[PDB]
Subunit: 118 residues, 2 copies
C-alpha cells in the first residue's frame, strides 16, 4: 500500500495571529478614519474579520483610507484588540456600544460572544 497523510496543528492559527499582532507598527496598508482620528491598519486582516470592511473595499477602492464615523475611537480600539487576539474587554458602560459596533461591522461571532454575557 501507498500512504499519504494530512497533519493539522490546531494552535497554528493563534500563533500566526500573535505574530501579526506584533506588526501593528511597513505592513500597515491603510488608515482607519474614525472621528478625526487615523489608525494605521493592515487591510487584509480587517477585511477578513469584518465583511463590512471587505465590501467597503470593493466599492471604495496616496494613503488609502477606510472611513468609519459610526463607532467611537475607544470602542474600535477594543475591537481591533479582539481582531488580533480573540479576546474582548467588556464593562457595564461598554458592552452595549460594543454590541452595536459588532453589528455595524458584521462581526457576527463577536456579537454572539457579547450577548452571552447579558
Amino acid at each position: 500500500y501507498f500512504q499519504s497523510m494530512a497533519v493539522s496543528d490546531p494552535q497554528h492559527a493563534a500563533r500566526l495571529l500573535r505574530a501579526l499582532s506584533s506588526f501593528r507598527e511597513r505592513f500597515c496598508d491603510a488608515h482607519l478614519v474614525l472621528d478625526g482620528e487615523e489608525i494605521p491598519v493592515q487591510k487584509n486582516i480587517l477585511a477578513a474579520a469584518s465583511p463590512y470592511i471587505r465590501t467597503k473595499l470593493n466599492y471604495n477602492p496616496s494613503t488609502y483610507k477606510i472611513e468609519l464615523e459610526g463607532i467611537s475611537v475607544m470602542v474600535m480600539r477594543e475591537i481591533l484588540d479582539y481582531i488580533f487576539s480573540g479576546q474582548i474587554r467588556l464593562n457595564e458602560d461598554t458592552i452595549q456600544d460594543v454590541v452595536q459596533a459588532a453589528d455595524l461591522l458584521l462581526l457576527t461571532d463577536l456579537k454572539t460572544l457579547c450577548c452571552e454575557f447579558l
Copy 2:
C-alpha cells in the same frame, strides 16, 4: 463592587485564518519568486509565519519581490497551504524536502510537526 471582564473566543484565530485563505486571489502585496515562478502573496502573513521572510523584508525592501530559489514550487505550495490552514500534506517522497524547507524558512513548529511523523 465594580466588575470588568475579558472574554476570549478560542476559535477566532482559525476563523480569521479561513477568511484570509479566501483572499489568496487586491490583497496580494508581493510576489514570491521561486524557480522562474511567481506566486502573488500577502506580505504580512508570510512575514508573520516565517521569521526568515520577516528578516528578508527588513534587509531587502514596481511590484515587490521576495526571492526564494532554495525550495521547489511544489513544496512551497504545500507550505503556503500550511500557513493558511495549519494542515500540511506529507508523503514518503516529500517529508524530507518539507522538513528542509521548514528549516530554511525558520518554520520551527512546522518542523516539529514533521519530525513527529518519523
